Each structure stands twice: as structure tokens, then as C-alpha cells.
Design a protein around this ligand. Structure first.
Ligand SMILES: c1ccc(-c2nc(-n3cnnc3)c3ccccc3n2)cc1
Ligand SMILES: c1ccc(-c2nc(-n3cnnc3)c3ccccc3n2)cc1
Lengths: 239, 246, 240, 251
């Protein structure tokens, strides 16, 4: 009742599996009408079936956050059938490609965030929640990319929060640690063992434990939290 | 056998400095979520006021006198709670110790962390036995408007973060989480008193354009205490309306 | 022996972008003072000429060149020209709804120049890349937002590039100035300066020279184990 | 019996010598980092008082100073004791002058370790501040601990000590800045000491894998940074912690 999102529309990107899907189900559990997105029509349909199977109202759709056209078209569709999303959740490697990876990720956050801000500004209320990437990839390049993406996400989140706060729109981030998903489940055992050894709690996190934090941030009780990045990592801090 | 999101039914919670403001709002929020709540104060009148507040809101628990600077007060208070209510598995540290100068920070931080440590170590034994716990440390609000106020606030906040992260690392294998909540400018007795032009300027450093309510702090505490926050540990959650000063 | 171990820059070529005034010019003179051959750059021919005159007047060998760090072509052409006529720069100092584009542009420029100069440093197995942050630009909320964002981007970028190139004995550091005495701060009403000074423990503005001295240290052999760091030069005034 | 005060015994004018005979107090100067710091400040022209907790350490410091042509002394000092600190500083003031450069390098486990270390930094810092305030000039430089051990306990202690040092340094800087006294810290990473020199090669290889520069730092590389912070060119640097870790960042 206190935690309720009844009457809200929520847009969760990348909702067809793992953390995105858990987030979609948690906001649904709390009463939101949920629009979950995937990059394929089959993913969108899977989202709609998942939603239905858990008794959550809303829809799956196709969204490419790298495209201005996909973003404008998708928001127009949502406004036409439902209304304005006021909760929006944005959800080896090489040694040298950290720069393009971060740059792309932040350009996508920015693109979607700016597009949804018009509606939140009209409503004088909003929640933007950015989900960082999960710990996992191998060696020095993986560590470099993780730390860079996390620093980008924190600084971006703080700045956007300063820019939009006078409108009663909060902007926060959740930075996960080593979370049990399809992408971490079949990491080489030795890499997994070593990651577990760096975690005080001595276990992987669950997607649901990320989603609970997102659901708190989306609620009215988190209205004075903004510009924050909440680490959800079992005490494993990697800079 | 119940199993609900956010529920603290069956838990005993100890909230230090619970007679007013943030501490009292925290005590009521944990009560709202089903905890048996023990709130503490350094005086018998503060303890009575806590008992009355709890009773008036239909929260089971007690108000007790506790001096966190004293090993004897800490052992006595825990023994009493164990006898009459059970082991506190949720512990919220909100107790801390003319105009303010920038030379007070050392003794203030030193005293506060020594007390956090004393209480935390005492309650860990029960949590270790239960293989479950929540320790939540509340930071101090911005105490004055100028440079001295910033210095003292930034020092206390840096101490609290580092302490919190370290203790979390020390106790995590036992499924005990240790987190902190760092308020910014909260509507309390301090803010209520200052000049109107000075208020306006204060609000101008806060992106949300308003003071925080004690209740907004308490809601964050209540989340951290829940099962859903089980993989959050070592964290400091800023609750400051976007006003970041270090 | 204890008393003779070079912390001078004789025999090095240094490239200092945005060298026509203020901080960039002081950095160019300090590296010159320490013995480097200095190429300072500006975006205009007039700025380049001013740099050449300033260098000549202080007895520093090098040149003033035109360089636009936002352009791949200007960057490749200018380095090729430097390699032909002076040698490979092994010390490179980057000094040249709004916050997002500003940070994005700045980091794209740092990345472009850094990658271009890394080839020569890799060949020499030695280098110094030093990024200069922006001074506190403006007084209000927008200024704070822009300043903190640019600083956070600079720090993360700096740390990541340092990790990428460290095995080659190339260090990558940043210097983050606070309030510095420049054309910006000179124009403030006399009283508004007093209020600004009240937030700075040291009670004064920094000098361009004080930024330059820190750069000159980072460039030296004694700073060889410092990488990935951002050195705040702000008189104790910290804002994030 | 034990003598606690040992002078170094010490016409070339070295280009390096800019600290002009100013007096520098370097605690924990008998070996490793402390000793390199003492030599570097000597190289830059300071009169250097290095301290150790034993008379034999103090004598070793005096010999090291003498052998490098540095003017100053080795003294006994216990930074955990108010009495040792007051007595030693009074002695220095009488016999050598007010130290205007002070380098603090002498320092369930993490809490008591950090607490003790900060209390020592505070005690010494407060004691030397009167002389700096009179001179309207000073440098206080705090040296963090090296990465002490390989596992979780080592990481907890290291991160806690570092976070305490940074927050303390910034707060003290704010407190003493209006007097033109700077307060900074240097946070080392993995440094080549007697301890690290003798680890099994497979353990050393794995350690080096976490350091982008691919090597241990030298004590001298810490000292150089301290020396820069002590100079007039670092006058607008205060409240800062300079990491010196080859790109290895642990929190
Ligand atoms: C673990 C991590 C940090 C700290 C600690 N202690 C302090 N402090 C202690 N006593 N006086 C000041 C601090 C004072 C100012 C700023 C940060 C501080 N941090 C202690 C344990
Ligand atoms: C590695 C580490 C960090 C960043 C990065 N990029 C940004 N950013 C990028 N593009 N536009 C803004 C940032 C914007 C605001 C605050 C911090 C930022 N950090 C990039 C690489």
C-alpha cells in the first residue's frame, strides 16, 4: 500500500530476461502498468507473455535505444495507447574499446532520458533509474571497461539529477555487482570462484535483489533520493 | 508462516536516539512494517516519551535509557532487551553527541565512530548466532550554513562511509548487512530557526528545491532493513535532494 | 649522486594545446623552463604567432602551431608536421542540456589527441599525457553541474586511459584546477570575489603558474609511478 | 646507556637545494619510505630531523644523513604519546628550530588501527601548528600505508586506512588553510620493500598483474612526490591525496 505504483506507467528497457525482466515484474507487482522493451519482435512478444503470466498489465514492444527514430516512434505509440511513462528504467573485451562502449551507453541513456522528460515535466513528477552493468568479463580489459562504465554512469546520473530536480523528477542509478544471470551462469569456474572470493556476503546476487532496489527508488518514499548510485554488490567494491 | 515483501514481522529492532526527529520517524516506520521496536534516549524523560509515542501509534516495544559512550550502559541495555523482548537483529544507530567552528570535526567524528563501533560489536554476537542481521548507521544532517558547517558535515560523512564499508566487509560472510544513510538538509529544529534570505540561499543549493522530511529518511531505512535489500551492504545511500557536498 | 639525478626535461619534446594564454601559456613556459622543446598550439594563426613570440621572448625552443583538436585531419596533419620538423612529442598536455554535449566533446577531443600521440610514445617506450580540467566556470547551479560533470568525466577517462597504456611506461594523469586567477575571475565585481574567496580555505585565487608547476612535476621522472591520478589544485575548495 | 639525540655531523651549492635550510621533521625515517623521504628533503636543501621509536633507529638515521651530506639529526619519538611529542618538539625548537615541513610516516583490527593512526596524525599535526602559524607557512604531508597483505582482511584494512586518511587530510586542510599551511597525503600502492623483495615468483607475478605499470614502485618514487608537495610550487595544492600506485586502484 505504501510502496504502491498504482496509476503509474513504467517503461523498462531490455525487459525480456534477467535483471530487466525482474525489474518489470517488480514494478508490476507494485501496481504499475508496465511496458517492457526488446530489440526484436519475438522478445517483445515474450515480454507480453511474461507479463500476462504474472498478472501484470502492460505490453511488450520493440525499441532500439541507439536510434532517435525508434525512440520517438516508441514513445508516440505508448502515449497513444496508454499515456506518458513517468517511471523509466534504462537497462573477452578489448583494452582499448572502453571509450566507444561508454560513449555509446551514455549517448543511449541521454537519448531516452531526454525523450521521456517532456512528459515528466508536464506531470511535474518522474523517476529515471539507470541500471549499470553486471560484474563478470575477463581480465584487465573487463576490469577497465567495468570501472569506466561505472564512473560514467555515476557522473551522468548526478548531473542529470541536478538538471531536472526542480521539476520533482528524481534520477538515480543502481550499480550491480556479481549477479546470477544467463550471462554469468556459465562463466569459467575459475573466474567465478575468484569473483566469489572477493564478495563479503560469499554469494552471487539475484536479479530480484536488484529489482527490489529499483522498486524502492520508484516509490514515493524515495522522493528525496536523487543523483545517487546505489551499489548492490554484497560488499564487493571495485574501482 | 507468513512471507511478504517489506515485512518485519517477527523482528526486534533497536533504534538509538529515537525520541524526536529522524530517530522517532525511523522508530515509527519500522513499527509500521511490523517490527517490535526498542527506541532509546540518554534520559529517562526521553525514554518515557518514546514509550508514549510507540503506544500512541500501536507499535509494540519499549523506550530505554542508553548511553552509547558507555560499555556498561550498552551491556545492560542489551541484556534487558534479550530478557524481555529478544535479540535485536535490526539495529539503527542514530544517536550522536557557542557557534560552530571548523576545529570541532576531529573530536565529533572520533566520538561518534567509537560509539557506533561499541554498539555494533555488542549486537553482532546475537546476529552471528541468528546468521542474519541489519545494521544501519544514520549520518548527521548539515549542521550549519558556512564553511565550518561544510567541514564538519563532510568529515562526519567521510568517516561514516569508510567505517560502514569496512564493517560490512568484516561481517558479511554471516549474512549481516551494514549500510548507512547520509541525510542532507532535513527539516528539523536547526533549519526552522534561520533568517529568510539565508533559507532561500540554502534551498538554492538543493536541486529538488526543498528540505527533506524525517519520514523520507525513515522510508530508506525501512527498505534497507527488509529482505529485498539483502544484497546491499557496505553502501551509503545519500538522501539529500541532489545536494552533494564533500 | 643523491644530489644529481635529473628531474629536468632536456631532450624532450612537449606538445601543449591551448597555449596562447592563461594556464596553457604558463604550462608551456614552465616546461620550457625545465628544458623541454615546446610546441604550443592555438586554433588560429594569430594565437600561434602569439605563442611563437612568447616562446622566443623567454628563450624557449619550439614553435607555435595551429591545431583544432576537434578535427582528425588537423590532428594527423599537425603531428606529421611536428615529427618532420622537431621530433615525436613524448610529453602531451591537453589544455584546449549543455553539460552532456560539453563533456562528450571534451572527452572525444582528449581521446583523439591521445590516440594520435600514443604511437610515438609506444615507440619510445616512454610518455606523459597530462589532461587539464576546467576551472570553476560560473557561480550558480548550472556552473556547479557543468564543473562537477566535466571533472567526473576527466577523472574516469584519465584512470581508464592510464590502465590501457601503462604497460608501455606511459603515464596518464589529470590536474583539476579550482578557482584560478584568469580573465574569467578578473571580471567579477569586487565584492563577489570576496564571497568566492570565503569558500577557499587558503583565502586566495590560484595562479596559472601554480597549475603549471604541478604539470611540470607530473612530466618528470620522479612522477613515474603516478598514473591514473587527478591532482586537485584548488586551495582546499572541493566541489563535486 | 642509550642516547636519544644524534646529529649528522654535516662548499657546493646544489641546484636542487630550494628548501633553504628550512627544518623538516620526518617520522619513521630509519628505513624504506621514511628514509627515502628524509634523503629527498635533504637533497632539496632542508635540515632534516628523522625519527624512530628506538635509540638505535635514531643513530641509524643520523649515520644515513651524514653519509649523504644532509644536515640534521636522528631523534627518538613516539607519536602515540603526548609526552614524547611535546618533549621532542620542545627539544627540536631549542636545538634546531621550528619544523615547517612535517611528514607523518610513523603509524576487529581495522577499527583500532585506523583510530590509532588518525589520533597520531592529529596529535603531531596539532603540536607543530603553532610554529607554522607564527611563520605563516607550513607543509604537513601524511603518508598512507602500502598495500599490506593479499586477501580480504588486507583489502579491508587498506581501504579503511585509505578512506580515513583522505577524509582526515581534507578536513585538516580546511581547518588550517587560512594560515598558508597546506595539508596533503600520499597514498602508496605496492612498493618495493624488504617484504615484497622475497615473495615467491608466482605470487609476485600475480601481484604485478594487478598493476598497469607492471612493476613495484620504488621508495624514491614516493619521496619525489613528497618533495614536490613540500615545495613552493605546490602552494595551491591542499586537502589532496595523491595516489602513487602505478595505476592499481583498490577501494
Ligand atoms: C574507518 C574509516 C574511516 C575512519 C575515519 N575516522 C576519522 N576520524 C576518526 N577519529 N577522528 C577522525 C575520520 C575523520 C575525518 C574524516 C574521515 C574519517 N574517517 C575510521 C575508520
Ligand atoms: C570513461 C569514464 C567516464 C566517462 C564519462 N563520460 C561522460 N560523457 C560521455 N559522453 N558524454 C558525457 C560523462 C558525463 C558526465 C559525467 C561523467 C562522465 N564520464 C567516459 C569514459
Amino acid at each position: 500500500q505504501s510502496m504502491s505504483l498504482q496509476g503509474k506507467v513504467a517503461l523498462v528497457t531490455g525487459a525480456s530476461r534477467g535483471i530487466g525482466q525482474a525489474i518489470a515484474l517488480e514494478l508490476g507487482r507494485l501496481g504499475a502498468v508496465v511496458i517492457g522493451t526488446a530489440t526484436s519482435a519475438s522478445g517483445a512478444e515474450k515480454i507480453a507473455e511474461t507479463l500476462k503470466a504474472n498478472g501484470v498489465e502492460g505490453a511488450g514492444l520493440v525499441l532500439d535505444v541507439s536510434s532517435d527514430e525508434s525512440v520517438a516512434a516508441t514513445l508516440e505509440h505508448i502515449q497513444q495507447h496508454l499515456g506518458q511513462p513517468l517511471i523509466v528504467v534504462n537497462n573477452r573485451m578489448k583494452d582499448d574499446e572502453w571509450f566507444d562502449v561508454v560513449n555509446t551507453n551514455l549517448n543511449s541513456l541521454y537519448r531516452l532520458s531526454k525523450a521521456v522528460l517532456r512528459g515528466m515535466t508536464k506531470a511535474r513528477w518522474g523517476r529515471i533509474i539507470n541500471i549499470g552493468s553486471v560484474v563478470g568479463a575477463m581480465g584487465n580489459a573487463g576490469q577497465t571497461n567495468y570501472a569506466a562504465a561505472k564512473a560514467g554512469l555515476e557522473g551522468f546520473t548526478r548531473a542529470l539529477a541536478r538538471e531536472v530536480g526542480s521539476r520533482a523528477i528524481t534520477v538515480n542509478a543502481v550499480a550491480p555487482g556479481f549477479i546470477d544471470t544467463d550471462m554469468t551462469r556459465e562463466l569459467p569456474e575459475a573466474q567465478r570462484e575468484a569473483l566469489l572470493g572477493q564478495i563479503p556476503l560469499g554469494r552471487l546476487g539475484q536479479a530480484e535483489e536488484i529489482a527490489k532496489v529499483v522498486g524502492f527508488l520508484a516509490s514515493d518514499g524515495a522522493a528525496y533520493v536523487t543523483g545517487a548510485t546505489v551499489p548492490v554488490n554484497g560488499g564487493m567494491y571495485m574501482s
